[PDB]
Amino acid sequence: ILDKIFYGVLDQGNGWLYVYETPNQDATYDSALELVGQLNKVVDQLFEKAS
Amino acid sequence: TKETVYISSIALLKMLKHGRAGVPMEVMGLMLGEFVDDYTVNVVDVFAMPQSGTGVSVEAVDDVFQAKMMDMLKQTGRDQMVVGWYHSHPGFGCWLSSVDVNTQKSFEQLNSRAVAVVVDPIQSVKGKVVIDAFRLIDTGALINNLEPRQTTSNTGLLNKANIQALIHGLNRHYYSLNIDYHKTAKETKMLMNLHKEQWQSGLKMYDYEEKEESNLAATKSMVKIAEQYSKRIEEEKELTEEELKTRYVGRQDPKKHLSETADETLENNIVSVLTAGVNSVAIK
Amino acid sequence: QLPYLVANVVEVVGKAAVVKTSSRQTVFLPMVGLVDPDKLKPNDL
Amino acid sequence: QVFDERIKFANQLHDEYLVSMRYPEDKKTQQNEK
Amino acid sequence: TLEPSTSITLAERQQLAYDLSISALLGDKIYNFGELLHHPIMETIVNDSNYDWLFQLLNALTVGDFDKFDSLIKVQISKIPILAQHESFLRQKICLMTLIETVFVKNIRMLSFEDISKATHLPKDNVEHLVMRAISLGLLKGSIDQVNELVTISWVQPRIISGDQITKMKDRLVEWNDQVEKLGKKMEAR
Amino acid sequence: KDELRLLQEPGSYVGEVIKIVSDKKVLVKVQPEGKYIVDVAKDINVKDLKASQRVCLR
Amino acid sequence: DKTENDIKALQSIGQLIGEVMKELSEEKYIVKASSGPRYIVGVRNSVDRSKLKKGVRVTLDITTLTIMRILPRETDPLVYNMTSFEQGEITFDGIGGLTEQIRELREVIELPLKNPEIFQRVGIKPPKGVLLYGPPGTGKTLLAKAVAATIGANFIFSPASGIVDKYIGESARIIREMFAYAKEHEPCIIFMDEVDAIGGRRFSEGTSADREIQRTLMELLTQMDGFDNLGQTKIIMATNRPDTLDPALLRPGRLDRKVEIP
Amino acid sequence: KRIQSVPLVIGQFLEPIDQNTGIVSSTTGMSYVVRILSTLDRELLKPSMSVALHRHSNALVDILPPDSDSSISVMGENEKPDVTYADVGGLDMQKQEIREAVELPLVQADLYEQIGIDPPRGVLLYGPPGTGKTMLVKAVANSTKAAFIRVNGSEFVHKYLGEGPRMVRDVFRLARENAPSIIFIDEVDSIATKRFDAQTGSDREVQRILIELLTQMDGFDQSTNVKVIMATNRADTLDPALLRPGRLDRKIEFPSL
Amino acid sequence: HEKVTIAPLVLLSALDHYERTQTKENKRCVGVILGDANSSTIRVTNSFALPFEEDEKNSDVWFLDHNYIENMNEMCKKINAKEKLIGWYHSGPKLRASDLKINELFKKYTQNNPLLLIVDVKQQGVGLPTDAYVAIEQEKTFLHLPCTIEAEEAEEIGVEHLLRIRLTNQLKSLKGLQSKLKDVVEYLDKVIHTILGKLQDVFNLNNLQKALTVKTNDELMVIYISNLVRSIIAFDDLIENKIQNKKIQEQRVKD
């Protein structure tokens, strides 16, 4: 499971098992990676060229 | 003086459709109406004419066919005097009709109000709807009734007038082309209810409901991938100039992805909020 | 049309005819009733 | 509930800004330029 | 109903009604035994001499007792189990039409196996197999739940019945007009 | 407004000026066609046109 | 009544004809008109994107520049320079005496064209080319028309004398269109003749006065080993001796079978 | 909608004049001044390329790719070959030499920058065809996900003059814009053979095919926009540019033992 | 069923013929449609009005001339050979013995089923002044067919020269619900079952909806993700104006 071969988790207390899907998430925060890069550079140029 | 033709919404669509078959092929039709000279001019209804071996010509007018139509056009009261003819030709810079030259001279003897209309585009219309007519002045435009008192006349400045090949004399004897369209009370409400920009009606409750929320099968499907498309469009152009100077030689690059992804997002939000906004009352 | 144009038929699919005129322009049109498949041949008017 | 508030938070800086562009531009365009 | 065509005497109308009676006994298609009552069939024939079979089975759907109808008939039609099997589908069918709006005004859809047990004269364990045969024959479309004992169907063949049915039908359309006065008037002010 | 003027373009080819005529009309050689004499514009001098001069012809 | 229908047929409007040079997109194709240079047109109606692709002959609209209908690809006449006939002609009586080689010929030709599962369970790839060589005029014509008669596929005769010329051109366009004809009609088999004239190995497989010879030898190899081969059509060549054929075509993958005509 | 719509024609761009103004050349033989697209200005406008125009109004539409498809000098191209990579054993001697000269410069080439050398622009093959040559190179393009173009020694051979060098330049023009491209050359000794005698008429192209083939290699600097793989069947000595490590790096000789 | 596509030129010319004849409310106008009925979508490429006389007080009084039909059909053969008679239209909201008996009269000259059209000259309510109706027997039963308005390329462009979102769909959707409220009321007083059988069938079409509550919040989740992109639209305008502001402060300096 730690090698990302079989996807699933067990139950030690009751001896049960659970269902675990492969994808853990979607692509959302990735779109913010481009916005944070422009606001940490261009914005610095906005104040310097104006002053 | 001259005559200002006033084609309504009914006559313009009929005279055009008759000449929309083929680029090289030429056809002809007959115009009917009741008016008086001294400006004003109307057209009631039109119908196409059969094509002879000469195509468009003066001998192509069938007096047998024309007499039978005027009897069949009397049932609805649209039968009137002959106000002219309309033809179909590919069009040129001057003398759009490749055959008719002096044929109007024989038309002026029958009716002095008769004109010859030629449709230049032949399904080339870009929305301007430019049609050409003709009237024989014969000897005139010197010490006589003054035509250019009405609208858009005395043209020919330098070498550029209309098509720019006609300049002053236009086709023959400076016929002083004047064309205007009008809409009556019935033509106003009918056209706006049929064709204005695009006709979505009759679906009005499903108009934007079926085209969007019910079309979600594949339209916006996988919105998470649709948002990924807006990411690649922005990341491409935003990467160009981060220094606010001249590097990659561009100007509107930051505004290219701005307007494209703005209308897409505006459509993504309106469709999504109206999914449950219709309120079909599902309950349980 | 009484001034007929000279043309050479390349192929007389079944009801469609392929003719190439002297203008170096080939057109695709279905066969009409005034012509016959044996009447359309090269070296013919 | 937080998502709907953060939509207007971004628009808060929009109305306090676009007005500030034309604010100086009056006296800029009124002066004679070479 | 055809006046000019099919002109027969009075004796042949009851003989044709006998064929109409035995036609609906072995199947539930095209409404039920009460469909021929609205048509001038049962009202045009006598109520005795075993011509009332179509009338007694209409009220037997709400009562839900086979012994009451079996006592008024003979051994000929009571020996075929198809008549007893396909009659239970129509008894629950009335309860199946209650899933939209009948009693509950909140349009809550729930079906308990104990309510249809006394109505269809069938035990609780055989309820799962009764609805299963309905989907196989194409009678009803939907899904069932054995764990929670819940049944949800799309539609069967909604009947021509009236009165309290059409009264509740208008109330559901009021909620459509209520949104015009609630949600509709708010969008007009925007 | 700039679109409507540029929507209909009659087209213009490229030609080379050959010689000038005392009639205020200049000879221009056309590569696909051949030498053809045109009329000079109002902002273009006919005397300033020399041999092998690239100009635009409508 | 037949006269009126013939008069109504004169009012119909025909269109032009062309061939797709390149596929730009699904709704836009780059074509070449027969009345002028290359054009780019659209689609009109009844357009099947599966049967219409780059190279498929189309009916071009003279007015709006659209594709009205769909037609098979034809450039050079395929019924004149190439001999095409329905099934075969010569029966198996004239090829008698070769039955030992005929049964082996049917297993490598007739069987894979009908039931490909024969070699699939064995694991061997079906042979593409089969060389029938012998004395001139002896067994070349008989064995050619007998294969198409017993199998039922059409008889395609493409002599090698109609490719290599001293005239400029006439190299690739014949093999490409021959591959296109066998692609449209699956039940077909291609036959050739006089391969010894278009062959020879030179030395380094270069070209000295070989301009039409080498372009033909290399193109025949790229058709079978390319991305698209003929699975329903087998290539047959007829010559005197295999020594007159390019060793590049003699390698496995192109010519897997050699049958000698005694 | 008025710029493109249904009607479209083929043209060749020549020189611009002003913004949204340029001089082009159509296929009819008559040049006209069209309206350059508002998107194309300078950096996006190529000096000479085949483009798309309007039938009547004559306005610029789109930039067409340098398609090499024609009726003369046709060079075959395979799209997504179905041959499985490493489907034939005994290639460990060759397969080890292929990865470093193919897989590394097309994928791991950033490692060559850490070394300080340019990646190999090609590799030579020596041996009888059919073994690790024909079907093998088609399977290598699968792992690299590159366009596989077939340019042989006996191809583009015709009696016409001038199309030989013209077609080779158009292929490199397309292979320069598209990085994932591979060009395999079978029987290179056909092209490598030079002129030892005067052929008088109709053969001028023996030397002409070496001009453009060596211009894309020795003409410019060392960079790989395409994989040029040559294969030698049997040759004694042919080395116009071929031997020495000027551009080509590895020479693969198929063991005969 | 089938479909019907009527060009706007047919309906525009059909209304003016009602005015040309000066027909009052006591009479109605009848005309013939021309087109191609062979396909599944019936299209009307031509029409002409007929001098139809009728008495409103007597359903047995009607006047239909068949001689004008034979002559007009022969005249159209020299105009367009692809145009044939696919049926006949008529005016007025009411369907009476005059319009039902003449349906078989045009059937003699019409190969396929004549297409019936009720033309509203006053254009009362919603859209579609003319509805598509087909004749079928089980008593005459007229079934409604979908009526779409579609024209040619130059036809739609030519009309635009003559005349040269969210709230729109909501206001049009509420009018449909109000028309249904009056639909059940007007039908209830008429009986005191066939239409109600189809209505009660489509009414049923949170046991299974317990997991269907999340899908409402899933779309609202993307809306905020879209608003994040929508905010970026104005975040560049926030940067775009400072691109000017740096040049704005360099103006007074040069003056």
Could you please report the per-residue DSSP string of G17-39? -EEEEEE-SSS-EEEEESSSSEE
The amino acid that residue F18 corresponds to is I
Beta carbons within 8 Å of D32's beta carbon, 6+ residues apart:
I255
Beta carbons within 8 Å of B280's beta carbon, 6+ residues apart:
none
Alpha-carbon span E95 to E111, nearest angstrom = 8
Q: Are G211 and H159 in contact (CB under 8 A)?
A: yes
Q: How far is residue H255 CA from its own chain's centroid?
A: 29
Using CB atoms within 10 A of its CB, is residue G9 exposed (0-12), middle (13-18) or buried (19+)? middle
Alpha-carbon span I181 to F20, nearest angstrom = 86
Using CB atoms within 10 A of its CB, is residue B12 exposed (0-12), middle (13-18) or buried (19+)? buried
Residue count of chain B: 284
Q: Are G179 and G223 in contact (CB under 8 A)?
A: yes
Alpha-carbon span G231 to E131, nearest angstrom = 54
Q: Which residues of H are annotated as a binding site for ATP?
A: 127-134
Residue with tokens 């008989």: G142
Paired tokens of G79? 């019924």
Residue B51's SS3 state is: coil
Report DSSP state, residue G256: E
Asked if A50 lies within 8 A of I235 by C-beta distance, the reply is: no
Residue count of chain I: 255
Q: Are B230 and B220 in contact (CB under 8 A)?
A: no
Task: Assess G184–H contact: CB distance below 8 Å, yes or no.
Answer: no
Alpha-carbon span E166 to E169, nearest angstrom = 5
Residue E109's SS3 state is: coil
Of H72, H79, H187, the CB nearest to G205: H187
Q: Are G206 and H189 in contact (CB under 8 A)?
A: yes
- Measured in degrees and rounded to the nearest 5, phi and psi for residue A5 equal -100, -65
Residue count of chain G: 262
Report DSSP state, residue B85: E
Beta carbons within 8 Å of C26's beta carbon, 6+ residues apart:
C10, C18, C19, C20, G16, G17, G34, G35
Alpha-carbon span B132 to B146, nearest angstrom = 22
Hey, which residues does E77 pair with through a beta bridge? Answer: none
Q: How far is E125 from chain B (nearest CA, A)?
A: 27
Residue D1's SS3 state is: coil
Q: Distance between terminal CA atoms of chain I? A: 78
Q: How far is G9 from chain I (nearest CA, A)?
A: 8
Q: Which of E1, E107, E155 to mutate to test the interface with I (most CBs of I within 10 A)?
A: E155
Task: Assess C14–G contact: CB distance below 8 Å, yes or no.
Answer: no
Q: How far is G37 from chain C (nearest CA, A)?
A: 11
Closest CA to B206 of B131, B257, B274: B274
Q: Which of A29, A35, A44, A48 to mutate to test the interface with I (most CBs of I within 10 A)?
A: A35
H197 CB neighbour count, 10 Å cutoff? 6
Q: Which residues of chain G lie closer than 8 angstroms to C32, CB-CB?
A: 6, 9-10, 12
Beta carbons within 8 Å of I249's beta carbon, 6+ residues apart:
A50, D24
Closest CA to H26 of F16, G39, I130, I153: G39
Task: Assess I68–A contact: CB distance below 8 Å, yes or no.
Answer: no
Paired tokens of H169? 């330049």
Q: How far is G35 from chain C (nearest CA, A)?
A: 4
Ordered DSSP codes for G157-194: E--GGGT--SSS--SHHHHHHHHHHHHH-SSEEEE---
Residue A24's SS3 state is: coil
- CB-hemisphere CA count at 13 Å for I168? 9
Alpha-carbon span H89 to H99, nearest angstrom = 16
Q: Are E63 and E45 in contact (CB under 8 A)?
A: no
Q: Are G60 and G13 in contact (CB under 8 A)?
A: no
Report DSSP state, residue E183: I
Closest CA to I10 of I45, I49, I51, I52: I45
- Measured in degrees and rounded to the nearest 5, phi and psi for residue A26 equal -125, -175
Task: Give the chain H residue nearest G222 (alpha carbons).
Answer: H76
Using CB atoms within 10 A of its CB, is residue E21 exposed (0-12), middle (13-18) or buried (19+)? buried
Residue E85's SS3 state is: helix
Q: How far is B282 from chain E (nearest CA, A)?
A: 9
Q: Which residues of G are annotated as a binding site?
A: 134-141
Report DSSP state, residue B274: T
B98 CB neighbour count, 10 Å cutoff? 14
Hey, which residues does G259 pair with through a beta bridge? Answer: G132
The CA radius of gyration of chain F, in Å to the nearest whole number, is 13
Q: Are H149 and H181 in contact (CB under 8 A)?
A: yes
H195 CB neighbour count, 10 Å cutoff? 12
Orientation angle between helical segments I214-254 and A42-50, nearest 10 degrees: 30
Q: Are E180 and I174 in contact (CB under 8 A)?
A: yes
Residue count of chain F: 58
Alpha-carbon span G65 to G63, nearest angstrom = 6
Paired tokens of H67? 């398609």
Residue G259's SS3 state is: strand
3-state secondary structure chain I: CCEEEECHHHHHHHHHHHHHCCCCCCCCCEEEEEEECCCCEEEEEEEEEECCEECCCCCCCEECCCHHHHHHHHHHHCCCCCCEEEEEEEECCCCCHHHHHCCCCHHHCCCCCCEEEEECCCCCCCCCCEEEEEEEECCEEEEEECEEECCCHHHHHHHHHHHCCHHHHHHHHHHHHHHHHHHHHHHHHHHCCHHHHHHHHHHCCCCCCCCCCHHHHHHHHHHHHHHHHHHHHHHHHHHHHHHHHHHHHHHHHHC
Paired tokens of B99? 């055959």
Alpha-carbon span G142 to B157, nearest angstrom = 83
The CA angle H229-H234-H240, to the nearest 5 degrees, is 60
Q: Are G249 and G258 in contact (CB under 8 A)?
A: no
Residue with tokens 């470093």: H100
Distances (CA, A) of I30 to E50, G184, I13: 57, 54, 13
Alpha-carbon span G24 to G26, nearest angstrom = 7
Q: Which residues of A10-39 are buried (b: 16+ CB within 10 A; e: fewer)?
A: eeeeeeeeeeeeeeeeeeeeebeebbeebe
Alpha-carbon span B150 to B147, nearest angstrom = 7
Q: Which residues of chain B lie closer than 8 angstroms to I202, CB-CB?
A: none
Beta carbons within 8 Å of E105's beta carbon, 6+ residues apart:
E168, E171
The amino acid that residue C31 corresponds to is M
Using CB atoms within 10 A of its CB, is residue C25 exposed (0-12), middle (13-18) or buried (19+)? middle
Q: Are B46 and B11 in contact (CB under 8 A)?
A: yes
Residue A18's SS3 state is: strand
Paired tokens of I10? 């047919």
Ordered DSSP codes for chain H: --SSSS-EEEEEEEEE-STT-EEEEETTS---EE---SS-SSTTS-SS-EEEE-SSS-----BPP-----SSS---EESS--PPTT-SSS-HHHHHHHIIIIIIIIIITHHHHHHTSPPP-EEEEES-TTSSSHHHHHHHHHHHT-EEEE--SSSS--SSSSHHHHHHHHHHHHHHH-SSEEEEES-THHHH---SS---SS--HHHHHHHHHHIIIIIS-S--SSEEEEEESS-S---SS-SSSSS--EEEE----
Q: Which residues of chain A lie closer than 8 angstroms to I249, CB-CB?
A: 50
Q: Which of B232, B239, B242 to mutate to test the interface with A (most CBs of A within 10 A)?
A: B242
Closest CA to G60 of G30, G23, G16, G26: G16
Distances (CA, A) of A49 to B244, H105, I243, I250: 9, 43, 9, 10
Residue with tokens 């009109």: G44
Closest CA to H152 of G240, G221, B192: G221
Q: Distance between terminal CA atoms of chain H? A: 68
Closest CA to G248 of H134, B203, A23, E154: H134
Distances (CA, A) of E166 to E102, G14, H111, H149, I255: 10, 61, 80, 74, 83
Task: Give the chain B residue nearest G10 (alpha carbons).
Answer: B51
Q: Distance between terminal CA atoms of chain A? A: 57
Q: Which residues of chain E lie closer than 8 angstroms to B283, CB-CB?
A: 106-108
- Starting at the edge strand that comes first in sequence, how are the strands of the sheet with H181-185 ordered? H77-78, H147-150, H181-185, H227-232, H122-126, H250-253
Give me the helices (H) in B141-200, please: 185-194
Beta carbons within 8 Å of E102's beta carbon, 6+ residues apart:
E164, E168
Beta carbons within 8 Å of D16's beta carbon, 6+ residues apart:
none
Q: Are G181 and G78 in contact (CB under 8 A)?
A: yes
Residue B226's SS3 state is: helix
